[PDB]
Amino acid sequence: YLDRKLLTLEDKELGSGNFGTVKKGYYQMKKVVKTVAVKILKNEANDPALKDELLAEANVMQQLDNPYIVRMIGICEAESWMLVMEMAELGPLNKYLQQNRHVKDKNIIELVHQVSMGMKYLEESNFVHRDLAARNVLLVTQHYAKISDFGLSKALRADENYYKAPVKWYAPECINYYKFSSKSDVWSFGVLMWEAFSYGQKPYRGMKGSEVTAMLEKGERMGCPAGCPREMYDLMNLCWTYDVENRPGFAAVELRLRNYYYDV
Amino acid sequence: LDRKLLTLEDKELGSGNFGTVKKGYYQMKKVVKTVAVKILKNEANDPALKDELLAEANVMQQLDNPYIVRMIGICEAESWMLVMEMAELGPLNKYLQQNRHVKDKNIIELVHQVSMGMKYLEESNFVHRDLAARNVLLVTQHYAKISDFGLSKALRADENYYKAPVKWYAPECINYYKFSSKSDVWSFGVLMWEAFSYGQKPYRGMKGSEVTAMLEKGERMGCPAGCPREMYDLMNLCWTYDVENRPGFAAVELRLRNYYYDV
Ligand SMILES: Cc1nn(-c2ccnc(Nc3ccc4c(c3)c(C(=O)C3CC3)cn4C)n2)cc1CN1C[C@H](O)CO1
Numbered sequence: 027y028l029d030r031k032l033l034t035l036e037d038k039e040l041g042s043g044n045f046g047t048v049k050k051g052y053y054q055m056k057k058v059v060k061t062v063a064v065k066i067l068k069n070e071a072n073d074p075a076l077k078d079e080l081l082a083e084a085n086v087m088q089q090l091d092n093p094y095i096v097r098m099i100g101i102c103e104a105e106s107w108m109l110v111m112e113m114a115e116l117g118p119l120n121k122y123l124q125q126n127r128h129v130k131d132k133n134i135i136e137l138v139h140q141v142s143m144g145m146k147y148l149e150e151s152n153f154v155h156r157d158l159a160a161r162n163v164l165l166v167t168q169h170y171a172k173i174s175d176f177g178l179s180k181a182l183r184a185d186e187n188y189y190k191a192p193v194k195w196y197a198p199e200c201i202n203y204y205k206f207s208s209k210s211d212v213w214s215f216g217v218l219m220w221e222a223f224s225y226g227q228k229p230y231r232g233m234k235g236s237e238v239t240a241m242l243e244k245g246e247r248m249g250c251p252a253g254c255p256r257e258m259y260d261l262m263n264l265c266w267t268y269d270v271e272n273r274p275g276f277a278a279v280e281l282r283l284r285n286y287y288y289d290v
Numbered sequence: 291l292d293r294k295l296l297t298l299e300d301k302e303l304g305s306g307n308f309g310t311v312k313k314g315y316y317q318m319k320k321v322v323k324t325v326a327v328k329i330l331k332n333e334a335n336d337p338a339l340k341d342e343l344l345a346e347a348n349v350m351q352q353l354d355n356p357y358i359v360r361m362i363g364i365c366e367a368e369s370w371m372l373v374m375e376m377a378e379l380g381p382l383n384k385y386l387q388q389n390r391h392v393k394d395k396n397i398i399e400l401v402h403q404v405s406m407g408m409k410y411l412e413e414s415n416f417v418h419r420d421l422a423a424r425n426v427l428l429v430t431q432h433y434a435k436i437s438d439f440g441l442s443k444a445l446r447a448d449e450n451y452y453k454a455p456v457k458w459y460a461p462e463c464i465n466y467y468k469f470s471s472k473s474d475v476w477s478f479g480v481l482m483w484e485a486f487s488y489g490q491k492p493y494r495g496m497k498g499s500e501v502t503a504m505l506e507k508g509e510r511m512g513c514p515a516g517c518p519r520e521m522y523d524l525m526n527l528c529w530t531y532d533v534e535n536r537p538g539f540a541a542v543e544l545r546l547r548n549y550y551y552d553v
């Protein structure tokens with residue numbers, strides 16, 4: 027638990043969500059101060075669902091150590107509950123690409139490849155993310171991506187490869203059977219890839235959840251983004267494999283991205 | 291079709307005498323559509339395989355029914371390819387082999403859908419000539435479709451049979467090379483037997499000549515374990531020796547609909 031006295035928050039929020047606010051801050055550490063991004067729960071965290079989510083979020087991040095995952099500094103209880111993370115200065119991947127249409131496809135391949143390495147680590151750690159979307163990828167630089175937002179994440183039971191409980195990111199077995207696996211994160215990764223090469227457009231634009239579900243059950247898939255490398259669109263369709271057992275894991279996905287970046 | 295708009299997955303879904311079946315993705319008007327692609331072996335050097343694929347496609351282009359696999363098109367590239375709408379779960383026999391939990395009511399539903407596809411083919415005056423469980427494809431566990439029209443024939447206006455897989459063939463096919471919708475009904479009975487046997491092969495361990503003599507003696511395959519009695523009775527009606535006395539698919543479809551409604 028962090029000392030609210032060692033934390034300075036900037037008044038102007040970086041943004042907001044259903045949960046409350048994200049603020050920039052500075053946290054005094056040993057000798058230097060470190061720039062932090064602070065997730066702050068709305069209305070003094072009166073909502074127990076928000077309090078539960080933040081505590082589970084922190085519990086998961088405390089266990090993870092990987093260069094492509096956002097590091098948690100700690101949690102602070104004062105005026106509201108706050109989650110203190112190492113600042114990734116450029117912010118969410120989708121908003122950044124929306125405002126930077128000049129980013130090259132080779133650049134995008136690099137960033138989604140780093141996501142796949144973060145997710146390979148999570149997969150080998152037997153955690154499922156369950157909210158893998160472009161909005162939950164944070165940019166340290168234009169060439170350094172990190173995964174954040176573990177509010178929905180779960181550590182898997184040692185005897186099963188799925189957890190049994192954002193529909194546009196969810197695989198069929200999540201919608202049909204409430205079963206979340208690393209393979210279901212791979213499906214979401216495909217949508218995240220589609221968002222990245224669409225410079226941050228929303229997937230399945232203008233469709234209701236039930237309409238997305240029927241489209242996928244018919245065997246249809248989102249089309250290829252303008253200017254998207256063909257091999258990357260082929261990889262998205264492999265991520266959108268209907269059958270869980272046939273869909274690739276993150277080991278295979280990471281290797282495919284590594285090989286294709288080498289080719290570019 | 292434009293080979294540039296088709297992506298094929300390396301790992302085949304399976305193979306046969308003709309070559310391979312691969313999963314693919316075809317760019318449509320706006321979305322991409324998941325396809326199953328029949329690919330001829332050895333750059334389609336075999337003329338019999340090339341002729342079978344073009345006949346297959348000529349038949350499929352004419353058919354429009356929810357219980358028949360839809361053809362997207364043909365692609366002439368590294369080999370000749372037949373591009374179809376993907377039926378995700380694959381052939382009926384292999385599925386039931388790996389899913390013994392499937393319930394009899396469920397199997398009744400699946401063979402009834404085949405009988406509706408075949409009633410459409412019958413009223414269309416096409417003979418399938420290869421109606422077996424392996425040629426039924428599952429879209430879901432509750433939605434079956436007929437495929438594999440490589441042997442199918444459009445009937446002449448003046449006759450109800452074509453004159454040219456023995457274990458699926460009616461006596462008049464073996465004895466007289468005569469193929470009618472009634473001979474498809476005989477095959478459907480074998481297909482029903484396969485389905486309620488969870489994908490076991492019919493006449494296990496017998497040569498074709500031995501199958502033929504068995505049927506000419508009036509013997510038939512026995513009832514599969516746990517098969518509903520009315521369904522085994524319907525199989526025996528499908529195996530009516532006399533082609534004129536054997537039911538058509540109108541009557542067969544009706545029997546299956548009325549028996550399904552009884553549960
Ligand atoms: C759990 C979490 N960690 N985390 C984070 C971690 C490390 N560094 C940064 N840096 C940073 C820099 C500039 C930023 C933003 C963030 C930002 C927002 O976050 C807006 C969306 C609320 C808007 N701008 C301009 N952020 C943000 C969240 C929560 N969010 C993420 C999802 O998009 C929705 O809830």
Ligand SMILES: Cc1nn(-c2ccnc(Nc3ccc4c(c3)c(C(=O)C3CC3)cn4C)n2)cc1CN1C[C@H](O)CO1
Nearest residue numbers: 303304305311326374375376377378380381424437438
């Ligand atoms: C003409 C034709 N159409 N067609 C088709 C059409 C639409 N959708 C699908 N989906 C699908 C999904 C999973 C599948 C398979 C197929 C599969 C095979 O086909 C194996 C048998 C070769 C193995 N797996 C796992 N297939 C398949 C064939 C040819 N075959 C069928 C007969 O069994 C013998 O030749």
